[PDB]
Amino acid sequence: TTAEGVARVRKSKGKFAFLLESTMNEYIEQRKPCDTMKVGGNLDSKGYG
Amino acid sequence: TTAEGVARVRKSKGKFAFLLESTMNEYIEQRKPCDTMKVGGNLDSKGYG
């Protein structure tokens, strides 16, 4: 689950990075404790239907 | 023209920055005299048709 990926980033002291959709990334970047960040450009361009 | 924007960056001693598509930016970054760089993420995501 996405939540598990977020936890792994948050708990791994910088030793795990998570590949996920920009929408989810940007959402989590605005949630406490505000310890994650989106870096780089997006790797592709698509949409939800 | 794009060429004019490139020239303006190259000749302006750091006092001009040019907003252009990532494709053109990345191409010029690999042309002599290798004095320009793409910085930051892309501002949008789109395509040529």
Swiss-Prot record, chains A, B:
Q: Where in the cell is it found?
A: Cell membrane; Postsynaptic cell membrane; Cell projection, Dendrite
Q: How is it modified after translation?
A: Palmitoylated. Depalmitoylated upon L-glutamate stimulation.
Q: In which tissues is it expressed?
A: Detected in cerebellum.
- Taking the record's annotation, the residue ranges forming a coiled coil are none
Residues engaged in binding L-glutamate: E21
Q: So which domain of life are we looking at?
A: Eukaryota
What do we know about how this protein assembles, alone or with others? Homotetramer or heterotetramer of pore-forming glutamate receptor subunits. Tetramers may be formed by the dimerization of dimers. Interacts with EPB41L1 via its C-terminus. Isoform 3 interacts with PICK1. Found in a complex with GRIA1, GRIA2, GRIA3, CNIH2, CNIH3, CACNG2, CACNG3, CACNG4, CACNG5, CACNG7 and CACNG8. Interacts with CACNG5 and PRKCG. Found in a complex with GRIA1, GRIA2, GRIA3, DLG4, CACNG8 and CNIH2.
* Function recorded in the entry: Ionotropic glutamate receptor that functions as a ligand-gated cation channel, gated by L-glutamate and glutamatergic agonists such as alpha-amino-3-hydroxy-5-methyl-4-isoxazolepropionic acid (AMPA), quisqualic acid, and kainic acid. L-glutamate acts as an excitatory neurotransmitter at many synapses in the central nervous system and plays an important role in fast excitatory synaptic transmission.
Q: Which family does it belong to?
A: Belongs to the glutamate-gated ion channel (TC 1.A.10.1) family. GRIA4 subfamily.
Q: What is known of its domains?
A: The M4 transmembrane segment mediates tetramerization and is required for cell surface expression.
Spell out the note in the miscellaneous section: The postsynaptic actions of L-glutamate are mediated by a variety of receptors that are named according to their selective agonists. This receptor binds AMPA (quisqualate) > L-glutamate > kainate.
Q: What is this protein called?
A: Glutamate receptor 4
Q: Which organism's genome codes for this protein?
A: Rattus norvegicus
The gene that this protein is the product of is: Gria4
- Complete protein: which residues are present? 707 to 755 of 902
